[PDB]
């Protein structure tokens, strides 16, 4: 555990943005007390200050199970979140999709969305947008990057991409 790079930080923040925009301070000034970053093993780690502030009696290992995952960087130095964030990102996400039957067991299996099982899409979604991807039941399934915009999806042909892969659970 220790607290992350200026420069690591800055790639993690801009990279959360992409689908949460400047809501991450709403998951580090939690109500129940201020959350942090801790890097281990080249993975971030969301994990309370109080928690934190009991290295040295905890084992380490304990403590990294302690936090929450958000995702690891890569040798290229940039940021890969995981969906272990889902939960803690899907609240803060304002652009979402929400997907048909057909395209989620597709997704669950890692594959793109298609036109045909896009269900709807949150208003003015731009083309690349980062989105946070729903079943039909409003359930987290992912994240995912709009392939065309909100006002293309609707004049696109069902075999078209919607939505491009990023990571899914299960």
Known sequence: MRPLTEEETRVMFEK??????????LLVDRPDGTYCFRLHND?????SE???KLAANISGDKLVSLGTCF????????????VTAL??????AKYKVWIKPGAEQSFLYGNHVLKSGLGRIT???????????????????????AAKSTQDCRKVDPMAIVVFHQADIG
């Open 50 to 52: 109080k928690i934190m």
């Open 87 to 92: 939960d803690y990102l899907a609240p803060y």
């Open 71 to 82: 995702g690891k960087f890569t040798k290229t130095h940039k940021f890969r979140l995981h």
């Open 16 to 25: 959360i943005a992409k689908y949460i925009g400047e809501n991450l301070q």
């Open 43 to 47: 993975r971030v780690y969301y994990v």
């Open 123 to 145: 208003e003015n979604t731009s083309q690349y947008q980062g989105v946070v991807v729903y079943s039909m039941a409003d359930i987290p399934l992912g994240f995912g990057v």
